[PDB]
């Protein structure tokens, strides 16, 4: 039973630092369908967000067994994806939260698709419940 549980939601003032976490469970990240032969060349855990009244847009993702990451050109200098070596948790951090960010954040995970492919298509087999983030004055 695959499961994704986002968290870190709430609200903050412009400039405050937010940390988001997502507990994945039910994914072996053992090279997806292809097989163990692909343990290292496959899989992705990342983040997406939806601005109230806007499209679901990709933010960033990291590799489940490697250090590969990928960010939406628009955000390499305002966000940072991380992962726990265990490969059962994903973290999206950001400091100096702008109001441009205010929106709902969702974590995704795909057994066999690189973090880059996950971001460009975009694509992901599993989505998180969604956690709302909203900045103020």
């Amino acid at each position: 039973a695959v499961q994704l549980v986002d968290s870190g939601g709430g609200t903050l003032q412009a400039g405050k630092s937010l940390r988001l976490s997502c507990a994945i469970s039910g994914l072996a990240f053992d090279g997806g369908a292809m097989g163990s032969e692909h343990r290292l060349t496959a899989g992705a855990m990342g983040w997406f967000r939806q601005a109230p009244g806007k499209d679901r847009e990709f933010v960033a993702a990291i590799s489940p067994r490697t250090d590969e990451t990928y960010y939406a050109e628009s955000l390499e200098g305002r966000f940072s994806v991380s992962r726990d070596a265990a490969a059962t948790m994903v973290f999206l951090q950001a400091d100096n939260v702008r109001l441009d960010d205010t929106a709902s954040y969702y974590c995704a995970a795909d057994e066999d698709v690189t973090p880059r492919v996950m971001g460009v298509i975009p694509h992901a087999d599993h989505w998180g419940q969604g956690t709302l983030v909203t900045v103020s004055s």
Partner: protein
């Protein structure tokens, strides 16, 4: 009645906005259909007892296709098609591998539909690294060709584009 006449295959192969023309209904029909065809292959394997050609053993050849079709194998060694593994492979081959997506990956300028009635056809030569590279295509980095896809521009890079007739 005016309009366009498009093919399913071609439309699927190109992806992009074009693909939305296909209605949710024709999509399921095509999926289930090919789903059943795979089950037929799984059934043909479960039944195989011998093998001609001299290639290898029924053991090897069976594993080869178990891999090609992402087949699930049980205790009895009987293969079966996994719905989820099927959707992903079908999805992978028809929604992910598209011309449009490849364009997002090469960062190049390209048509927005598989249809084209232009008569412009050019001669080129990508071999020389001065004209075309594996990573930049025609739009050579740290060059004037760099941005605005000037490298793909017939006028601006007229050297790499001899026009025909």
């Amino acid at each position: 009645m005016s309009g366009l006449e498009v093919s399913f295959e071609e439309l699927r192969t190109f992806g992009g906005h074009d693909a939305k023309f296909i209605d949710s209904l024709q999509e399921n029909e095509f999926r289930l259909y090919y789903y059943n065809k795979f089950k037929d292959i799984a059934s043909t394997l479960n039944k195989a007892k011998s093998i001609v050609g001299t290639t290898a053993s029924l053991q090897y050849m069976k594993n080869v296709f178990k891999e090609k079709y992402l087949l699930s194998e049980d205790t009895s060694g009987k293969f079966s098609v996994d719905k989820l593994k099927f959707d992903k492979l079908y999805k992978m081959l028809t929604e992910i591998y598209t011309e449009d997506n490849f364009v997002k990956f090469f960062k190049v300028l390209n048509r927005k539909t598989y249809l084209n009635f232009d008569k412009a056809v050019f001669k080129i030569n990508i071999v020389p690294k001065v004209n075309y590279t594996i990573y930049d295509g025609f739009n050579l980095r740290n060059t004037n060709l760099a941005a605005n896809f000037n490298g793909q521009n017939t006028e601006i890079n007229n050297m790499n584009f001899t026009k025909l007739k």
